[PDB]
Amino acid sequence: SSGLVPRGSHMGYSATAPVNLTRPATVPSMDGWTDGTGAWTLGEGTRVVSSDALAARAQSLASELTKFTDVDIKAATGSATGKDISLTLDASKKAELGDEGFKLNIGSKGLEVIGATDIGVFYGTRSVSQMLRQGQLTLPAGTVATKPKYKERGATLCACQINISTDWIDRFLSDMADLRLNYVLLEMKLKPEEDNTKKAATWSYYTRDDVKKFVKKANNYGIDVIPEINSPGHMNVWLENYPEYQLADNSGRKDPNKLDISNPEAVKFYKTLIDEYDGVFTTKYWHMGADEYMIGTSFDNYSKLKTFAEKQYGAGATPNDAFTGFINDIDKYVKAKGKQLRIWNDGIVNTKNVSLNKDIVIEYWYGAGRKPQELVQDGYTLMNATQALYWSRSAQVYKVNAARLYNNNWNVGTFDGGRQIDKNYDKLTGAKVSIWPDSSYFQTENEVEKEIFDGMRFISQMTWSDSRPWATWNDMKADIDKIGYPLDIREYDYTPVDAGIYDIPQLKSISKGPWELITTPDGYYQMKDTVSGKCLALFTGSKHLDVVTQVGARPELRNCADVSVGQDQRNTANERNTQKWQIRADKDGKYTISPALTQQRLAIATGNEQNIDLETHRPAAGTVAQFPADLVSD
Ligand SMILES: CC(=O)N[C@H]1CN[C@H](CO)[C@@H](O)[C@@H]1O[C@@H]1O[C@H](CO)[C@H](O)[C@H](O)[C@H]1O
């Protein structure tokens, strides 16, 4: 017989190791590894040792490694042994490591993690977690120091019109952290409460408490959560109920998507929103969007903006001057609050009387303002937000192809439309993928999470390491799948109850039941009424992005869709996904039911819920309807 038996190496250091023992991969890669003699083994007795100040990091790492390795790993202070992982903050190593870099020394004193900041240590611990969670507990000795090439590395997450659940957001933040991604542009509505803004408290919105909680999580992971309220275009979710602030065309037709930048009250309204957001985000940036103001039309149709431009910025001024003037006035406004403005590149155009302020970060997504190379010449600060790194649920033109970009030598200097700039441009901040809902019934948020995996690893690698150590994309892919998700994602209880037959009293106004629950590949349920044989759907009501956003919309019974199929089945998407339900457990015990696409919660309507939508239509009192969680958490 073969005699095959586990090696079972003693814990700690060994001067003996095979010369080509695998070094488990990480993402980002840690390039320029120097090999040492021997190897180190996590095993019984291994501890995470640190100073008091690093105690929380050490405790979280010990707990996490205990779970991945099945070895009891505890945190400690004091002296470290060769059996141990040590965490060290050495702020004198800024030159070598910068603000986010780290050094690993693996050898006879154990596995040392050194960073120059708390986040550097944390980012080193992500590599330790990666290297140890792939079924190999012995690591080759040696040393490496790594630090990111670019300062801003991450994603646009448009949690916009539709709601991206806070649970999704928490998972996303965990994934970003694992990948050393430090930037998320979160276009989103914070629920407006003031007398002057509260009519825009339509769903999607996030509560102050909710935002505070995910910003605190983000910040502990080294992530800058930058809010965006897009202006002066794409303003439908803000202006629908404020027609007094909407821009009219020459014929008097208003667009709920356009702010009237000639109306000072409209401008004040936008600034009021800024001030509401200032209380809950911690970032030093404000992103005002500024994309697609005139989509589907032109400035020729808005003579009033030319008139305004001339009054405001002098004879000869054009609507493009008025537009840029509005951006510079918002720049002034946020600077006075201690923030730096960011915009999308596309409305930056041909001005006469006004020039765009150079202290505004330009996030470049569209070959449309200047070429990037033109903007470089003028000294603008640039982030690469190419459409090559977009996903959309509906627009199939936008699906990131990581294999292609990896193989074709894309780098962070490769601006939209294959427009290359010096990737060492000293005002090139980094790069990001972008995750856009657009027509939103085609894919659940859970399907988006499955789809974005590869691309998130791609961008992580190219913004930190700017290298291609895997010979092809396919070699990368094999290692990223081995590395897998971070612990929080593996722990998330997608489907907390077993498929089976249930009594659900909340649903009595639809049917006496019982209900047959089955699970879906994307972590939802379909609920079949055993009386009618039909399935529960959230199908009807006023929509944004083709998803029901109406507060107080009622579910209904419909012929049962096939919820077992994938997102490639685009023809049946809406009936399918309107039949998916997310079930969550309380802290502690009780279950809530949420339409998967909408992320509101089913509740029995009391008639005392307060929301602008309900001022004009309420579900009949005592019937089951969807509501944002804040209206039914009493
Ligand atoms: C900056 C940008 O990409 N602007 C738009 C054009 N491309 C993407 C992908 O199709 C669009 O999603 C972008 O518009 C954004 O749409 C969302 C809803 O999906 C919001 O309305 C944003 O305000 C808008 O910028």
CATH number at residue 20: 3.30.379.10
248 close to 283: Cβ distance less than 8 angstroms: no
Report how far apart, in Å, the C-alpha atoms of 129 and of each of 73, 466, 485, 525 are: 13, 22, 11, 33
SS3 at position 489: helix
| Residue whose CA is at the smallest distance from ligand 1 atom 16 | 438
532 CB-near residues (< 8 Å, 6+ apart): 511, 557
Of the candidates 413, 415, 433, the one whose C-alpha atom is nearest the C-alpha of residue 424 is 413
Say whether 390 counts as a known binding-site residue: yes
Residue 63 forms part of a structural domain: yes
Angle of CA points 11, 15, 20, to nearest 5°: 95
Q: 436 CA to middle of ligand 1, Å?
A: 6
Domain that holds residue 478: 147-491
Residue 408 forms part of a structural domain: yes
Report how far apart, in Å, the C-alpha atoms of 147 and of each of 28, 31, 73, 106, 125 are: 10, 10, 28, 18, 14
130 CB-near residues (< 8 Å, 6+ apart): 24, 25, 26, 27, 178, 483
* Residue 558 burial by Cβ neighbours in a 10 Å radius (0-12, 13-18, 19+): middle
Centre a 10 Å sphere on the Cβ of residue 268 and count the other Cβ atoms it contains: 12
Instruction: Please state the domain count of the chain.
Output: 3
The strand ranges marked E within 333-462 are 340-344, 361-364, 382-384, 390-392, 414-415, 419-420, 428-436
Q: 371 CA to middle of ligand 1, Å?
A: 20
The secondary structure element, H or E, covering residue 508 is: none
85 close to 128: Cβ distance less than 8 angstroms: yes
Backbone dihedral region of 297: left (phi > 0), alpha (psi from -120 to 50 degrees) or beta?
beta
Query: Cα–chain-centroid distance for residue 497?
Result: 27
Task: Give residues preceding each break in the chain, C–N over 2.5 A.
Answer: none
**Count of all residues that appear for the chain in the document:** 634
Based on the domain organization, do 154 and 284 belong to the same domain?
A: yes
Say whether 230 counts as a known binding-site residue: yes
Q: 186 CA to middle of ligand 1, Å?
A: 12
Pocket mutation for ligand 1, best pick of 156, 157, 158 (most atoms within 8 Å of C-beta) = 158
Q: 597 CA to middle of ligand 1, Å?
A: 19
Based on the domain organization, do 310 and 404 belong to the same domain?
A: yes
Residue at which a domain ends, from 450, 470, 491: 491
164 close to 214: Cβ distance less than 8 angstroms: no
Bridge partners (DSSP) listed for residue 556: 537
Based on the domain organization, do 429 and 496 belong to the same domain?
A: no
Q: Which residues of 170-190 are buried (b: 16+ CB within 10 A; e: fewer)?
A: bbbbbbbbbbbbbbbbbbbbb
Q: How far apart are CA 190 and CA 629, in angstroms?
A: 14
Report how far apart, in Å, the C-alpha atoms of 279 and of each of 285, 411, 630 are: 13, 37, 19
Helix, strand, coil fractions of the chain, as percent rounded to 5? 30, 25, 45
Say whether 310 counts as a known binding-site residue: no
Residue at which a domain ends, from 435, 470, 491: 491
* Number of H-type helices and E-type strands within the chain: 16, 32
Based on the domain organization, do 140 and 193 belong to the same domain?
A: no
Looking at residue 235, which CATH number applies to its domain? 3.20.20.80
Resolved by: X-ray
The strand ranges marked E within 100-201 are 102-107, 110-115, 138-146, 152-159, 183-188
Pocket mutation for ligand 1, best pick of 161, 234, 384 (most atoms within 8 Å of C-beta) = 234
576 close to 560: Cβ distance less than 8 angstroms: no
Is 228 a residue of the active site?
no
Beta pairing class for 224-231 and 285-289: parallel
Based on the domain organization, do 315 and 264 belong to the same domain?
A: yes
Q: How far apart are CA 536 and CA 583, in angstroms?
A: 14
Q: 182 CA to middle of ligand 1, Å?
A: 22
Q: Residues 64, 193, 228, 292: which is the catalytic one?
A: 292
Q: How far apart are CA 270 and CA 286, in angstroms?
A: 12
Say whether 492 counts as a known binding-site residue: no
The phi and psi torsions of 459 (rounded to 5 degrees) equal: -70, -35
Q: Which two tokens stand for residue 492?
A: 């998330």
Beta pairing class for 515-519 and 525-529: antiparallel
Based on the domain organization, do 406 and 539 belong to the same domain?
A: no
Resolution, rounded to a tenth of an Å?
1.6
Beta pairing class for 254-259 and 246-248: antiparallel
Q: How far apart are CA 389 and CA 87, in angstroms?
A: 35
The strand ranges marked E within 559-600 are 581-585, 591-595
Q: How far apart are CA 62 and CA 199, in angstroms?
A: 48
153 close to 100: Cβ distance less than 8 angstroms: no
The strand ranges marked E within 454-499 are none
Based on the domain organization, do 404 and 274 belong to the same domain?
A: yes
| Residue whose CA is at the smallest distance from ligand 1 atom 2 | 291
Residue 278 forms part of a structural domain: yes
Centre a 10 Å sphere on the Cβ of residue 633 and count the other Cβ atoms it contains: 11
* Amino acid type, 216: K
Centre a 10 Å sphere on the Cβ of residue 19 and count the other Cβ atoms it contains: 6
Pocket mutation for ligand 1, best pick of 259, 399, 436, 440 (most atoms within 8 Å of C-beta) = 436
Based on the domain organization, do 121 and 260 belong to the same domain?
A: no
Q: How far apart are CA 557 and CA 539, in angstroms?
A: 9
Within 6 A (CB) of ligand 1 lie 158, 160-161, 187, 230, 234, 289, 291-292, 344, 365, 390, 392, 395, 398, 436-438
Q: Which of ligand 1's atoms lies nearest the C-alpha of 390?
A: 9
Q: How far apart are CA 235 and CA 233, in angstroms?
A: 5
Residue 4 forms part of a structural domain: no
Centre a 10 Å sphere on the Cβ of residue 50 and count the other Cβ atoms it contains: 27
| Residue whose CA is at the smallest distance from ligand 1 atom 24 | 234
| Residue whose CA is at the smallest distance from ligand 1 atom 12 | 436
Residue 34 forms part of a structural domain: yes
Beta pairing class for 85-89 and 47-49: parallel
Residue 2 forms part of a structural domain: no
Query: Cα–chain-centroid distance for residue 112?
Result: 31
Query: Cα–chain-centroid distance for residue 226?
Result: 11
Based on the domain organization, do 140 and 163 belong to the same domain?
A: no
Q: 281 CA to middle of ligand 1, Å?
A: 22
Based on the domain organization, do 209 and 297 belong to the same domain?
A: yes
Residue at which a domain ends, from 448, 470, 491: 491
Q: Which residues of 60-73 are buried (b: 16+ CB within 10 A; e: fewer)?
A: bbbebbeebbeeeb
* Amino acid type, 26: T
